[PDB]
Structures are given as structure tokens and as C-alpha cells.
């Protein structure tokens, strides 16, 4: 499912349906349009785990766990510069909400069937 998450993140980046941060995620869940969400686990968060699943797991939540924030940060691309090799100075990303309009692709049906269970 790693390639499915990669292609849906590429779809969100190519259609500008990707948003970064936790305050905008809070606004999206309070405004009741949050459909997709990706969480973080095994990170440098001291007591933020109970907080992030308390403010996340309300209703219709897909559980996606990323092992490292810094690996998540280069995956989202907070500082995606110097593409001819290694990025210069990246900082890891927190929990984000994916409000992407690209519901028709080669694996969006597979993603929705996996999240149906």
C-alpha cells in the first residue's frame, strides 16, 4: 500500500489538494470536510500521542502510521529543494489532512476498497 499512498500523495501534490500543518487540519475537521488523514507514530512526541489520536479519531478516520517524521517530511516535501541529489535542510512534518479532489485514478478504487474494511 506504500505505492498507493505515494501515488495519492503525488495526485494531491499535482492537483494542489495537499495541505500541511495541524492547525489547518483542526480547521478542516471542525468545518466537517476532512476525509483523509495520515497519523504519525514512534516519533519524538513526549505526550502528544494521546492528544493527536484524541483530536484525530472522531469519525471516519483512516489509520496510516509513518515511522519517522523526517521520512514523512521529505515524503510531503516541506523543503523539497536541490532535486539533483539530496535535499539541503529538511525538517520533519506533523499530522496532515489530505483533501484531494483526484478521486479517479489507477489505484484510488483500491485505496477506497482497502479503507472500506
Amino acid at each position: 500500500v506504500n505505492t498507493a499512498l505515494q501515488e495519492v500523495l503525488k495526485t494531491a501534490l499535482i492537483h494542489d489538494g495537499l495541505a500541511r500543518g495541524i492547525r489547518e487540519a483542526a480547521k478542516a475537521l471542525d468545518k466537517r470536510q476532512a476525509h483523509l488523514c495520515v497519523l504519525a507514530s514512534n516519533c519524538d512526541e513526549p505526550m502528544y500521542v494521546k492528544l493527536v489520536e484524541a483530536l484525530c479519531a472522531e469519525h471516519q478516520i483512516n489509520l496510516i502510521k509513518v515511522d519517522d517524521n523526517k521520512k514523512l517530511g521529505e515524503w510531503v516535501g516541506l523543503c523539497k529543494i536541490d532535486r539533483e541529489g539530496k535535499p539541503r535542510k529538511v525538517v520533519g512534518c506533523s499530522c496532515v489532512v489530505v483533501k484531494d479532489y483526484g478521486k479517479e485514478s489507477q489505484a484510488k478504487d483500491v485505496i477506497e476498497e482497502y479503507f472500506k474494511c
Binding site: 495541524i22 471542525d30 468545518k31 484524541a54
Partner: protein, 68 residues
Amino acid sequence: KSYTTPKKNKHKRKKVKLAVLKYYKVDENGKISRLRRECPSDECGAGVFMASHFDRHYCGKCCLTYCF
């Protein structure tokens, strides 16, 4: 350069870290609660909160202060 008149700085934003802890609270269960009210204006968002001073408050885009 250093003139006769002393230099006065602007409103520097203090690093109030972990302000997200002031947004919500966690009970024993998964339910959520807030200590800030909700602005009912259309120019304000459904999730946009309102400030907390000793007597009154302050909105965001609305900038309405409800006083009794």
C-alpha cells in the same frame, strides 16, 4: 546610526510554544471540549476560535467584541 532619539521596537511576537495545548482538552473518553467560544459570523470560519482576555474577547477576520 545611534542618534539622540532612542530606538523603540515594534510588537515583537513572543515564542508562545505549544499553543495547540490551549486549543482543546482530553477527557477519559474520546470526546472533546473547548474553553473558547465560537464566532457565529459568516466571515468567521466554523473552526476559527476567539481570544481570551480578562473582561472581553477578540475575533479573527470578524474583529467583533461582544460586550454586555
